[PDB]
C-alpha cells in the first residue's frame, strides 16, 4: 500500500475497463468509496516496480472481485486536479467471483453497463473516467 509517483508528483495508478466480452459492449463499474450511491471504474495505485498491466489486473481483482484475458493499453490519462496519471486496459472478464476483497471490508456493489450507460454515470463526478470509452 505504498503509493508510487511519476517525476512530475502525480500519483501512479492503472485500471481495466472490464468488459462482459470481446465484443466490448458492456462494462462492469463498481461503487464510489467516497459516496456509494455512485460509479467509478475499478482502478487503484501501482506499487512500487510494479509493472502497470499488473498493478491494473491486481486492482480489478481487489476491487470488483473479478478475472480475465487481459487485453490492449487504451492509454494514459491525467487527472489535473486530482494529480494522478492512470494507465487503462482492456480485460475481457472470464471470472466472477464471489466474496472478493472490497465487498466484505466495504461492501463495494458492481455492476455492468451498456457502453453509453456507463459513459452517463461516470460524466458528472469522473469525467476522465467516462473519455477512456471515447475511443
Ligand atoms: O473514487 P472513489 O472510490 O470515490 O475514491 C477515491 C479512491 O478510490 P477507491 O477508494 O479505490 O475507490 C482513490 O484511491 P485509488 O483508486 O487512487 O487507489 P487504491 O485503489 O486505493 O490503490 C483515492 O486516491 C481518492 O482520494 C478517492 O477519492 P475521494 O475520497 O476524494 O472521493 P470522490 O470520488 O467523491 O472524489
Ligand atoms: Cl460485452
Ligand atoms: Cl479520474
Ligand atoms: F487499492
Ligand atoms: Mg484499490
Ligand atoms: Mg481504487
Ligand atoms: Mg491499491
Redesign the pocket.
Known amino acids: 500500500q505504498t503509493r508510487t509517483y511519476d517525476g512530475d508528483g502525480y ?1 501512479k ?1 492503472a485500471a481495466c475497463l472490464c468488459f462482459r466480452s470481446e465484443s466490448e459492449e458492456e462494462v462492469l463499474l463498481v461503487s ?4 456509494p450511491d455512485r460509479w ?1 471504474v475499478p ?3 501501482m506499487e512500487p516496480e510494479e509493472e502497470p498491466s499488473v498493478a491494473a489486473v491486481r ?1 480489478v481483482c481487489e ?1 470488483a472481485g473479478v478475472k480475465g484475458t487481459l487485453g490492449r493499453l487504451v492509454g494514459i490519462f491525467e487527472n489535473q486536479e486530482r494529480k ?1 496519471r492512470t494507465y487503462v486496459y482492456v480485460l475481457i472478464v472470464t471470472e466472477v467471483l464471489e466474496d472478493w476483497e472490497d465487498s466484505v471490508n466495504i461492501g463495494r456493489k458492481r455492476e455492468w453497463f451498456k457502453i453509453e450507460d456507463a459513459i452517463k454515470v461516470l460524466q458528472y ?1 469522473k469525467p476522465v473516467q467516462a473519455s477512456y470509452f471515447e475511443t
Not at 464510489?32 to 459516496?35: A, G, K, L
Open positions: 500519483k495508478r464510489s468509496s467516497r459516496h467509478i482502478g487503484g495505485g486492482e476491487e494522478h463526478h
